[model samples]
Target: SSLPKQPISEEEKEGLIEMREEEKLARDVYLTLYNKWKLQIFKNIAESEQTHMDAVKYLLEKYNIPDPVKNDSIGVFSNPKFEELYKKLVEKGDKSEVDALKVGATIEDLDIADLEKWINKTDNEDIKFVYENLMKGSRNHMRAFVRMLNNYGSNYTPQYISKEEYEEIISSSTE
Candidate 1:
């Protein structure tokens, strides 16, 4: 039997605001790294993250949600792990582009998992639509990072399972 579709709700809109803030942080981190390293790959990924942020911002505006970017003082740049990584990348400079791509692939892999979890949890159609789109973008980002890694004679083996395994897990969980 097909699952019933659900309508969007105010709570889901709020959740999207939080999601946007995280994406903004991710973008800002990548942009800063790009400036420090002068890597075209990092810059490209940063631009893509910015585009994702713009889409999320549009949804916030449509739902009458306050712009989290304006009100939230929280920034991931202050995060110790992020700071450490950023400083390491900058210190390595031009030599870090390949390493940076590896980091990006890892981050995108985690993001894909997160989006899938959110999509499964939310019944709201609008939220599902947004998450699905983001999932696709994350997959693209992962592919781009892999390509970058390959160019440097490096390859990424994603930690996530195959589609069949994913289906088996999901089916078992719902049983």
Candidate 2:
């Protein structure tokens, strides 16, 4: 049910590494925001982000790339830049419940955009399959944040994704 073994390009390996850490970034932020705000959505999506991370880790192990995430604790990163970004995201989310929810949406926006780039960088069926499913989950999370934001009398303008794509995602029922 997956592609046959083939040489992984450098771009592909880097993509996996980026995704592994990026997924952890999402999970860590969600957990931190959940603890700060007590939002069930953040807690639930944090667990989902772990699943997303595991999906990428499976590919890394399959192709023999060392994991960038396995031993890291919350707020730590194998990529130092990600660590800084995580702190910045948490600081923004700590501003308020609404800010926390906006942080959630922003994470998904960046995730979906980054996943799309990685998806296009490889022809490996397994990686493509996993990334696409993760994008689906992110879209759902994006919709959830939008719905939550709507309750506060506003909507989100996309950060990394297109305005049309964001609107389409927000307007659609969760899949």
Candidate 3:
């Protein structure tokens, strides 16, 4: 199943590289927020985010694509954009538990959006399989973050996804 019938396009290659760091961005932000908020959600989600990162890393290695993550240090990123985002999310999450939950939701929202776009662009079954799994994981994460936000008397409006899609995802049971 891992065998590719055709070599990946430049778009897919770019997608994998960017996605690898984006997943790391989520993990790093969650870890920092967990420390600040002392919330179990942040800790649990951070672990899941690490798994997501590893999945992307596997593809990068299999394809012989150079990994952008040179350092495993938290908050460190090869991409300057992700590096700046980690700082911004950590600062925003440092404010309150509710804000931290919103950060989680926002990250998942963005993850799902990116995953969907990549999935549509790739014709490779292996790439589609991996990305779809990641999307399902992201959807589950979105649900969890939203549930926690509700508990904290806060509602998270979608930051990246359309409002209808966000509603549909939240209304459905976890996949």
Candidate 4:
């Protein structure tokens, strides 16, 4: 990570740490979805998700925050919310391949929203820059999920974001 571009607020510190497992949540869920669906979509995205996780790890170390996902296995989380979410998502995705694609949309949806919130909460250029990139990644993933849905002659309704925002997301290949 670049030298502290600015001091981290307590809220910013917490968001930085919380987002680590959120990304890991995406990875773990993606892997399980891959295990069940055997689609390279999940496999490819899971690797990108791991890269996102490492970016956050660098921030945690730079800011001297505790790494919550440290020493945890791929599917494990120190955060109770993540543990519950990971379990629920795997169960949901295991239902069908279409459901797995929807899970991908849901995960990316949440990630984009949270990253936007975090980006707004900090003035630190590094934090904003990294989060903007992650948000871009989520957008790219979201579009891929939507494409996968259409490939199956299905479509997704936004579960967590406004329809307008979700439309904006799927309308562009570039973020």
> Per-residue lDDT for 113 in model 3?
92
lDDT string for model 2 (83-165, tens) is 99899999999999899998898999999999998999988777888899999988999988888899878778887889888
Count residue pairs with overlapping backbones in model 4: 0
Better-scoring candidate (lDDT), 2 or 3 = 3
Residue 29, model 2, lDDT: 98
Instruction: Give the backbone clash total of model 1.
Output: 0
Best TM-score goes to which candidate?
3
3 against 4, candidate with superior lDDT: 3
Q: Model 3: runs farther than 4 Å from truth?
A: none
Off by over 4 Å in 1: 1-14, 71-95, 159-175
Candidate 3: clashing pairs of residues: none
Which segments of candidate 2 are over 4 A away from where they belong? 1-3
Residue 9, model 4, lDDT: 90
Tens digit per residue, CA lDDT, model 3, 1-175 = 3774557889999999999999999999989988887889889989999999999998988788999999999999988989898888888888888888888898899899999888989887788888999999999999999899889888988878899999999999978
- Judge candidate 1 against the unseen true structure and give its global Cα lDDT, from 0 to 1: 0.64
Ranking by TM-score: 3, 2, 4, 1
Q: Kindly report the root-mean-square deviation of model 1 from the true structure over all alpha carbons.
A: 7.4
Over 34-124, each residue of candidate 1 has an lDDT whose tens digit, in order, gives: 7656778778877888788888776666666767576433234433554454455444443577766766776676667767766766776
Candidate number of the best lDDT? 3
Cα lDDT tens digits for candidate 4, 1-175: 4673466899898898889989999999998889887999999999999999999888887778878986658688888899899988888889998999988999998898888878888888888888999988888998888898999999988866789999887887765
Where in model 4 is the C-alpha error above 4 Å?
none
The window of 10 residues in a row where model 3 has the poorest summed lDDT is 1-10
Model 3 residue 156 distance off true place after TM-score fit, in angstroms: 1.2
